[PDB]
Symmetry: C3
Subunit: 350 residues, 3 copies
């Protein structure tokens, strides 16, 4: 019974292909919710929704509405049904809605915020279309670029001083932090791993991050392992640059690295120990680029939400090596690390 | 007699191909002036010049000098005569000169400003060359990217504190605007449409915008309709985000949207009602991206002049749909919406 | 005997192909040091190292360590041995190390700085890989983009307020400079040419720039001439915009232009008088873009080290002309201007 919910849930999709369209749309919405962490499982989407509800029901509502609007717009714009049914046209809008709720300065259940959310969700397919047409020619996935572009556009358009939809103030660092290294807590550092995973959706509740890790583990255990290791490497990188302890603890240092480790640790490159080590290196590089872009975009009053992960993973995927054990997965054969490794071994034998 | 001046004026070009080179150069300069609004009519160029003279003779002189210098440099750099005769190597420099005069802090008829203008005009062909070589491989036009690149370079090089050519101060918003919604004027909002069209050349005179609309209407009425609707949609987008009423009244919200509506409303995509609605959506998206980039580049002390229109239109042209009624025109068959629709219908029949 | 050390030193490479690997690695390190100024001569690398030692032994040590780490990482990542033996995987890291030492606020011989340097050096091959895979499809070289990307990442990650590795404060201009044109010194302006060449490695000692010019002259005299002329054109461009005389005297205006003149003056385009004039124009454009990006990135607290040269040279190489005398060299036939001209003449005859 457990095998029916593990992986991409191909059997459920095959059964739903001959069912009423409403159930299919619900499945697509759940897969879109899950695809933020490169998971194509509707049950993982339900678990991520439960985690968001544990963190903040307002954020869950906004993200669900964004996903629904994006999927409907993708159907209206006549995009590929294969990518809609896999939730590839609804995860950027899930992030857009959730992070629009997060970066709002107005208060929870500010209903007017639903109007820009919808407005910023219909733009998600367009981005996800154009970028795909640009990147599919290099066999590169469009990781989270639509969400980052849409959110940067929104938060630049509104800012902190908008009378309708003010955004939170992003102030650049002006004084050198005072760090007491005798007050470093091992328990808080350990909690920073699930919190780092949860910050992919902008959540700081450790339970939300744990539920996200469980949702990822439902699909593929290696993805969960790589998410945890990426969060840990983000913590290490934060300690390396003497970041404020509160920031590491809140997970700000380990969600970009977690996403990079998930992407490079078996998903978009075949899982070998060489690829595992290079995924750890990519996670460290992503954490460093994350603090770099955070400081950069604090000068323009913007948060560098997931730009670090996108740029670092694209850099590490474009990079070419003469090593046969470092294999870039074809974009039509990327399902999840366990299946990707089988495909890679079969290709290596032939 | 009216039919000799409507459209691209092919008959005049055919007659001028066997005339002295000076008259041909004047025709190329006028076509370059007109091609800012995607018009290839020398009479439309004369009308736009008259509008600029109505607004400010200094701006008209600077733009004319920029166009002349760019066309001469394109001839010197041995570029395609077909693109020079169509004014595609002189409109970016027209914008460069006019907006250099606009963003100057020195005073009208500051003759020394002609030296950087020329300097910033010879760079326009180079950009217009390279970008074309980059974008013609995707069958994408280079809308106004050379002008935006050149003007950003110039205004970053000089700034407000240059002893020779100071630029106007671009200050980011620091206080939330106080908007009295009982003082909204319908007459000012209605005037904001022609002013929005006129702000394509940086002009705020309603008569200048009216003359620009007449020049566009001389070539193709659908282009004029789309310019007006784009300006109106920019006004609506400004009202949506509670922009200061003076910014809407000045047309700062409706020239990027007007250009986007012109480009997407029959010029670079065949005019169907689906394409018309998507052009309206592109205009709204362009207005929102316009305020976003204005706020972004106010942090670096720069105006986001026409970057919004370029980026939004490129995004909407790269985006692919499985809808046969949403047709992207081949770049070798783009003349103006009336002819593009005939071409599209003939292709659809076959 | 002089002919054995002129040019790319092909005979030494052929002899070293059958020697112990340590000597080969030393040769690769020296060629990487030299390849910052597009020179593939180990003796030129020794001369550049002597110049760096004259300026600051700490900077020389840091750059040498960066080059060694990058070459070792490129060998580990299984990159092309042809590009490693030519030093194309070690010059970006040489610049990274030297400029990390330059932009450090801690003090000379701050040994902990070696840890980020190594960390920022292993990223240099990755960049140099990915960018190459992106740009080799347009037959475009990756000039210094890896170093600029790595240094921007590092200086954004650390900033001026990092407790471990603070960076120097980059403050944007806030007051209009007071320039006394009666105090312009011809001797200081003349010294600004070798200092401008030396600022390619971040050095301001005129003797260091002279040694760099001698190292370039050892390989190809035309490269030295173009470096000097590019520095002079940067000085002229600085005088054109009323830059502070101390900035010109420090060579901050003439290293991007010098690199652009070297690249366009016979290296990546065949040397004709048309190409020479266009290389001078590229140098002027590069100086103007240099001040533009310096002012731009001072708003984000970053130095625009070599971004101007990279972007300007890429723009001038992408640009296409119908002039047969403006020839872009194939990237597999680029050795140095004297040989490139012979290749171009042979191609022209056939």
């Amino acid at each position: 019974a457990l095998g029916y919910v593990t992986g991409d849930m191909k059997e459920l999709a095959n059964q739903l292909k001959d069912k009423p369209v409403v159930l299919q749309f619900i499945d697509w919405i759940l897969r879109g919710i899950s695809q933020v962490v490169f998971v194509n499982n509707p049950v993982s989407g339900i678990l991520i929704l439960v985690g968001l509800l544990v963190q903040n029901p307002w954020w869950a509502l906004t993200g669900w509405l964004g996903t629904v609007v994006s999927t409907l717009m993708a159907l209206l714009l006549s995009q590929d049904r294969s990518l809609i049914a896999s939730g590839l046209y609804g995860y950027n809008a899930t992030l857009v809605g959730v992070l629009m709720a997060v970066f709002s300065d107005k208060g929870d259940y500010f209903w007017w915020l639903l109007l820009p959310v919808c407005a910023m969700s219909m733009t998600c397919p367009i981005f996800s279309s154009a970028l795909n047409s640009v990147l599919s020619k290099w066999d590169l996935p469009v990781f989270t670029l639509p969400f980052n572009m849409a959110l940067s556009m929104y938060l630049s358009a509104t800012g902190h001083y908008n009378p309708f939809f003010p955004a939170k103030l992003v102030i650049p660092i002006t004084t050198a932090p005072n760090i007491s290294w005798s007050d470093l807590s091992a328990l808080e550092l350990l909690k920073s791993i699930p919190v780092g995973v949860g910050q992919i959706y902008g959540c700081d509740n450790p339970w939300t991050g744990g539920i996200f890790l469980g949702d990822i583990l439902l699909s593929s255990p290696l993805m969960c392992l790589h998410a945890a290791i990426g969060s840990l490497l983000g913590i290490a990188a934060g300690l390396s640059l003497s970041a404020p302890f509160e920031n590491i603890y809140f997970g700000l240092w380990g969600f970009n690295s977690s996403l990079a480790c998930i992407a490079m640790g078996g998903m978009f490159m075949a899982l070998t120990w060489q690829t595992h080590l290079l995924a750890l290196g990519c996670a460290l590089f992503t954490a460093y680029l994350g603090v770099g872009m955070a400081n950069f975009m604090a000068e323009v009053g913007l948060p560098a939400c997931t730009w670090p992960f996108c740029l670092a993973t694209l850099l590490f995927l474009i990079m070419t090596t003469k090593n046969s054990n470092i294999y870039k997965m074809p974009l039509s054969k990327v399902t999840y690390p366990e299946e990707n490794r089988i495909f890679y071994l079969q290709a290596k034998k032939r």
